Design a protein around this nucleic acid. Sequence first.
DNA 1: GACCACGGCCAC
DNA 2: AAACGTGGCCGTGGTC
Length: 540
Amino acid sequence: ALEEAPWPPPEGAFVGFVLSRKEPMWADLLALAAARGGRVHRAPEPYKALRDLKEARGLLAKDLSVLALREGLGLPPGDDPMLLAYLLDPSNTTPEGVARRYGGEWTEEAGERAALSERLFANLWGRLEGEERLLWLYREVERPLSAVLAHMEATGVRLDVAYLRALSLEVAEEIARLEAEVFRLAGHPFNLNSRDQLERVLFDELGLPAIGKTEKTGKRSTSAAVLEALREAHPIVEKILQYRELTKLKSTYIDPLPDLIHPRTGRLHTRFNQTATATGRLSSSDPNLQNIPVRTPLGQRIRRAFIAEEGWLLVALDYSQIELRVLAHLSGDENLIRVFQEGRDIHTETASWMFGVPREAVDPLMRRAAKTINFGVLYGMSAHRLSQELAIPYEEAQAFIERYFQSFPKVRAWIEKTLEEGRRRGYVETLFGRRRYVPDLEARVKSVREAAERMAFNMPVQGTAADLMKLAMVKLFPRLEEMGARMLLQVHDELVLEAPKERAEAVARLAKEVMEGVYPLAVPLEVEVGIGEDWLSAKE
DNA sequence: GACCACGGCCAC
DNA sequence: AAACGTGGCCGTGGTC
Ligand SMILES: Nc1nc2c(ncn2[C@H]2C[C@H](O)[C@@H](COP(=O)(O)NP(=O)(O)OP(=O)(O)O)O2)c(=O)[nH]1
Ligand SMILES: [Mg+2]
Ligand SMILES: [Mg+2]
Ligand SMILES: [Mn+2]
Ligand SMILES: [Mn+2]
């Protein structure tokens, strides 16, 4: 089809490339090609050939930009059909699916990938004609954001390896104590990591009551929520829960992360996936640095391992009560607007009530648990579940849900308005017009339809918060480059920056103002900021 | 070795 | 587990 032409391609050509593995910071570049003008250009040696491109345009452009940055090359990502497709329909998450849907096949050959990129861009650009709000999201948020994310991925974050190595040995001994006690109490050994074997021990051998079932297979559940209901029914349960806490943290964070330090940077590199969620959030993988522990004492020790370069400090910025502020703007509830114009904190107020203590007496943990309650109730938690979570009667949980919504009466009205337009249109949208298609709003099975409803009216709130965070990153990044600071991590409504010590205070003030003023709403956005040598100390 | 489904659980 | 939502990683179990 396309005519074979010699490398290098003309400027503006679409790129195709093949990696030895999905992670750009770790991949060998196996092949590189470009397409334009009815021609395909295949690079004889892909690494040297990278130097000839001025921009990465095509499928997965950010990934190639990250690998280019790793090699010390300034190759910014530009147009990417994945971003066009993701804005049309966020279920467009993979190149295999986007190709099949919009006019090609995702193969394992760079030249074909280049040609595909060119063809898909033409077609998806056609599909977005007249979709001015989606085009605004593309031009003003997603396309420039991909350059920011590429820099973040290639920079990475420093980890106190030696500290985590020592911690692993300590936690191993504590796990053995717990495992040995569980085996003694069971009367025999078994694989405590096997929920099938544990199910048999707890409910058949020890005759404990089984209060819940698993979704797909209908086994008697051994989840923490079920075990919590049995803490006093048998001493083994407590040991199991402690075993699970420690093995989760050791197997997921303590042991794996030190092995992922990159040999050239000496740092840890995540991937920020831009077309991965139904709501417009980013995701993080390989490793996921958006679920680093924070709750328990051991979790906090793990978070302390994330440190600044010597002579630098971390700056952590996190939006206050962000989805409740977004809800206030979307719904227009005067009571909820007044809450934020008055400086009130709904998480602290729920915590004080939950634990029966003055606001002053609430600590960050109790507040973070009240946060779960406030959003749980908002997005549809049942009184049955709430009464279990809070250890109160069904009747008192029922009453809490009623007063919650009676306090902000326009919220329920906004919920039902959102679902009505989602039924008529087939999608719901954020403040900026990002869409999520929810066909099951018309489902004839109530449980399916009602699950769809909770997904559907969550998306405008969570997605607007994501749009705002993304726009803030796009605005903030060039200001940080000017000041010699780095953007390292995003955790949905939070940024972790790295700044020279002498500039950390100025960077913190600037980043806070950029984030708070990203897009004025009917309520102020407030950002909490901290500075410290480690991630835990920077969020205090 | 790989793949996947599942339960389970960490964070936002 | 349960009528909160959004993700990704773990080990197990089954399979190729
Ligand atoms: N549905 C749901 N959404 C959640 C949950 N946890 C977080 N989110 C969503 C809604 C949250 O607004 C958003 C960011 O989460 P945080 O920064 O941890 N909490 P926030 O910003 O509310 O309070 P502050 O920062 O003052 O402590 O993620 C949850 O349990 N459920
Ligand atoms: Mg210890
Ligand atoms: Mg799953
Ligand atoms: Mn927040
Ligand atoms: Mn946060």
